[PDB]
Amino acid sequence: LVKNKCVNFNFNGLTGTGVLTESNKKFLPFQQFGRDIADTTDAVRDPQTLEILDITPCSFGGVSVITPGTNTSNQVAVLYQDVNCTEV
Amino acid sequence: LIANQFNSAIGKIQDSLSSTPSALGKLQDVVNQNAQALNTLVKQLSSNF
């Protein structure tokens, strides 16, 4: 089991990819899948243990180049939108 | 008298905003419409087409 790291997961056929963390939400004993309002997988119970694992999508976002005019300078700054830069 | 009427009017504005659930109807409708459009867009993935 790998958690807090983006990984391709296949729990009996979820065949999805994302970042898995410990879940405080309490499933029902018969329930396995998890879903949000928009009907996308949001949590899966571990087929081996009682633990519930959230599924957050692998961090993505646009890359914006922050530059002054090329006449003024040639230095640029890069913005990774909505991304924690522990994982850039 | 004008000052008291002004203060009481603002107080009544505060109370009427607090009471009526649909006071901010326009803003709530804008938010609901945007969220509903996004929800429809995401739900459209489930369609076989």
Partner: peptide
Amino acid sequence: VTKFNGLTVLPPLLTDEMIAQY
């Protein structure tokens, strides 16, 4: 007043704090 499948919600440039300041 009161689903990440390629959707990004860009934050407003003026935060509510500076809108309140204006």
